Amino acid sequence: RFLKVKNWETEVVLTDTLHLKSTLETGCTEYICMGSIMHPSATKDQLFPLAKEFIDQYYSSIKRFGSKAHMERLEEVNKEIDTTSTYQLKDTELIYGAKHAWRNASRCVGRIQWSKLQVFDARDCTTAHGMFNYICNHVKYATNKGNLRSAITIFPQRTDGKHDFRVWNSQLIRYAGYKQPDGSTLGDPANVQFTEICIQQGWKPPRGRFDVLPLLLQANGNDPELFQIPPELVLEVPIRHPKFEWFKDLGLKWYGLPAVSNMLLEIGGLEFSACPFSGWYMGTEIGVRDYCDNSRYNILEEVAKKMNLDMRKTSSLWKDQALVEINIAVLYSFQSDKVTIVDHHSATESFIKHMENEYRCRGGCPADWVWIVPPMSGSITPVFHQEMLNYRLTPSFEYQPDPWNTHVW
Amino acid sequence: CPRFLKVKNWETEVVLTDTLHLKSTLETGCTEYICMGSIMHPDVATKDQLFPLAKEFIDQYYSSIKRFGSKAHMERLEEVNKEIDTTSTYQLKDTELIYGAKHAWRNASRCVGRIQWSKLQVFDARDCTTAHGMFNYICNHVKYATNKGNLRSAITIFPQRTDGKHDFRVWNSQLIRYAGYKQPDGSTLGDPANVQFTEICIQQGWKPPRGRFDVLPLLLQANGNDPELFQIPPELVLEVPIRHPKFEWFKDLGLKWYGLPAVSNMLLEIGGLEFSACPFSGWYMGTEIGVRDYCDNSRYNILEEVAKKMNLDMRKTSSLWKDQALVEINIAVLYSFQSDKVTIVDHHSATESFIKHMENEYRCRGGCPADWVWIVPPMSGSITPVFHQEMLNYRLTPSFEYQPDPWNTHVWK
Numbered sequence A: 001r002f003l004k005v006k007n008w009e010t011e012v013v014l015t016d017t018l019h020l021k022s023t024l025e026t027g028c029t030e031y032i033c034m035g036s037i038m039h040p041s042a043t044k045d046q047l048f049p050l051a052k053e054f055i056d057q058y059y060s061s062i063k064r065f066g067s068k069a070h071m072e073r074l075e076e077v078n079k080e081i082d083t084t085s086t087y088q089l090k091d092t093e094l095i096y097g098a099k100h101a102w103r104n105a106s107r108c109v110g111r112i113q114w115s116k117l118q119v120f121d122a123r124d125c126t127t128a129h130g131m132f133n134y135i136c137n138h139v140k141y142a143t144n145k146g147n148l149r150s151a152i153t154i155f156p157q158r159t160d161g162k163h164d165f166r167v168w169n170s171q172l173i174r175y176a177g178y179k180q181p182d183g184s185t186l187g188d189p190a191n192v193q194f195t196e197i198c199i200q201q202g203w204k205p206p207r208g209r210f211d212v213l214p215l216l217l218q219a220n221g222n223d224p225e226l227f228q229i230p231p232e233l234v235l236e237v238p239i240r241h242p243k244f245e246w247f248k249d250l251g252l253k254w255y256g257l258p259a260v261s262n263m264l265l266e267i268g269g270l271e272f273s274a275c276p277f278s279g280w281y282m283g284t285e286i287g288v289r290d291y292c293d294n295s296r297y298n299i300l301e302e303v304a305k306k307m308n309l310d311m312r313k314t315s316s317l318w319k320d321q322a323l324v325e326i327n328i329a330v331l332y333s334f335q336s337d338k339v340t341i342v343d344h345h346s347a348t349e350s351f352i353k354h355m356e357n358e359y360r361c362r363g364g365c366p367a368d369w370v371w372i373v374p375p376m377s378g379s380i381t382p383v384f385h386q387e388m389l390n391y392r393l394t395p396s397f398e399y400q401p402d403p404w405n406t407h408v409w
Numbered sequence B: 001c002p003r004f005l006k007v008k009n010w011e012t013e014v015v016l017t018d019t020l021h022l023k024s025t026l027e028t029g030c031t032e033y034i035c036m037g038s039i040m041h042p043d044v045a046t047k048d049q050l051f052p053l054a055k056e057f058i059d060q061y062y063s064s065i066k067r068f069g070s071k072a073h074m075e076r077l078e079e080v081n082k083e084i085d086t087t088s089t090y091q092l093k094d095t096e097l098i099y100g101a102k103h104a105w106r107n108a109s110r111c112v113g114r115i116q117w118s119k120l121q122v123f124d125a126r127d128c129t130t131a132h133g134m135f136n137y138i139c140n141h142v143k144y145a146t147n148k149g150n151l152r153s154a155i156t157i158f159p160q161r162t163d164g165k166h167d168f169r170v171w172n173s174q175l176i177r178y179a180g181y182k183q184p185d186g187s188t189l190g191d192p193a194n195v196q197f198t199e200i201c202i203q204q205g206w207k208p209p210r211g212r213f214d215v216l217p218l219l220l221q222a223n224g225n226d227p228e229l230f231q232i233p234p235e236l237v238l239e240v241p242i243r244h245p246k247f248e249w250f251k252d253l254g255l256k257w258y259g260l261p262a263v264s265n266m267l268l269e270i271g272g273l274e275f276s277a278c279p280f281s282g283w284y285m286g287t288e289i290g291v292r293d294y295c296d297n298s299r300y301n302i303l304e305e306v307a308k309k310m311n312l313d314m315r316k317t318s319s320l321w322k323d324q325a326l327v328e329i330n331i332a333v334l335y336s337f338q339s340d341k342v343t344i345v346d347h348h349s350a351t352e353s354f355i356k357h358m359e360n361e362y363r364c365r366g367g368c369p370a371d372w373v374w375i376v377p378p379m380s381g382s383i384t385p386v387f388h389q390e391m392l393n394y395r396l397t398p399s400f401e402y403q404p405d406p407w408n409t410h411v412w413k
Ligand code: HEM
Pocket: A098, A101, A102, A105, A107, A108, A109, A110, A111, A113, A117, A150, A151, A152, A277, A278, A279, A280, A281, A282, A285, A342, A347, A371, A397
């Protein structure tokens, strides 16, 4: 049936028909909603219908459904799965599928950009050195001297599960984290464990507060290998405040390129377990989560110190004051260094415009409210007031298990 | 459905195990293929529908008092069954009414204040017959709950629905709200959210002061009759002028708010009985006023004026002038309430209390249904502990439910 979503601020009512096309589960039932669970719970016979559905929507997207080219592709794909237990996507299908996995990512507020995506085909890669070369070209292309460009690099698909290509880093660029003897943590505490895998594999840690981690790349199921991204390819921004001149003395920096490297791209039943993709940051990703999560850099006390705020009672909102100033600094710093960044007001507004577009031309837009609403100032952004329907469309980005939990050395 | 469901807290790594969801009774709106968790809203019971609903409730009540299967339990079941047989309804005992109201709060997945659920004063108003009598009961509620600023949570329960043509309803959505007036030029005076109800009040005879913070009259419907207007005695309406501890100019904005949040449009369901008039009240979390009431665009919408008095760059959104003003508005609200010794809770203490409450409920009860979309405060979400807490949402009974607006269904006499 048709379903209606309403924006309680504007009273706009959009009508969703696109959800009728889903078949993957969401995790919910009629009796329990799992909307805030972060991760709720092939063969030749599983593969062809998935392939058929994907080929069908591709040829339907270029408005040649049931065409001769369409019909031959179906048989081409049928014979190929038959004789080989898998198949290979055409270039056009690879690009279509990657853009549409982004389009369908319900947790991404940046999707108004979905059709501007540079797709790098790396399916001829065979070694970790080749992966490193492909990844360096990606980073260079996407960074573009601060004029960031969305990109994805796609390595060979899964075959038997024993020859997987994996980027073991969860993101291409991250800072190391170190367990200090006295119990505290230097660097990024989220990466203490991965840093120790790199140390244990031979990485010489500078043991600073913002050490860019090496790449750890696994090709064709082999043991992973370490590589250092050339530093001139790693663009970084010293964080300073437009009014508080003491802010630069905090010694804070961050990298310009957000690039998720641990997800699985599924297209037509094929699984690409190494598909690093990147865009540009929304300021709150750095200013709220990375810097102010209690389990991340956790800088709120320090900033509130220099601001000389009353920190004895929570109801002074000293944390909320320091939070806003930290996020002002991040936006100001990136903009002053001409590095692409978007504030959560502009991003959410664009996302509302995007939803409007997708409802008109596509009949819906899957969206996960829990993730779309920014982690600060929620209700002064328009998405807070926007009812959203969440559902799973394919091609898609999915989570997969960490490689250090399954790999036999 | 699986017997054990696990939720995780991603900041602390604490994993909790839920079995209470097996007792889920109503529908969420979600399916296996679509989640409706951000949808705001996703003729009486017959004898056959009523029997199992009542037994379910009575069994639960007698379990809670460690008398399950007792002689009193079997006798109460038999008496209730006979009453439904001969009268097609039944009456709750005072103990059962109190238990059911506290558990509807305890079950309210959208409420972050539930650590308090067992301290709820219940006023049995099932003997009320007229709107005047409703007015008396509501005044006593307001006075009791306000307590000169040392607020006490309370509920007043009017007679249950019979055939649906004799409903008791409070037409007000909340007991205390400010009027809103649409102007000929399209601007709005007062609270724009309340323009429709205000128009109804004026139509029913209310003389409007046409100010910015005019307390609305009560519009009260007894036994399905036409509703009648009453003015709450102003000495019973505690209000707080908003000032800022640092910014001397903040009081010059002329802002104030009422002290008592009292929801009066919900339906209380106990044992299949429907209490269509059950006003309940607690105390405010500051963000309800400082973020939503004051800074929602379609509400009082003061961010602009505060930012100007703060002399902020309002040309670029990336200056975060909105965020900066929003914080100071919420600082003023908490400061003004604490200075006047009116109970209020900030969003940091409320969410910490809720996490502790949720853990205890998981321990002692096997779960705690919670609606993350509502539990996370509307500002500074991720620096509160609920942001990082996975929650399962499901509908237990007794429950508070939404119901149609009474002007949309009432048959005028
Ligand atoms: C171009 C600018 C982009 C912006 C501003 C943006 C913004 C965001 C933000 C703020 C999140 C939440 C991330 C978190 O809290 O961990 C997110 C999630 C996500 N984004 Fe985008 N993004 C962009 C580009 C892209 C691209 C190019 C892709 C894929 C080709 C993508 C796919 C995703 C996915 C799959 C998620 C969910 C990841 C997860 O569930 O962990 N995004 N995005």
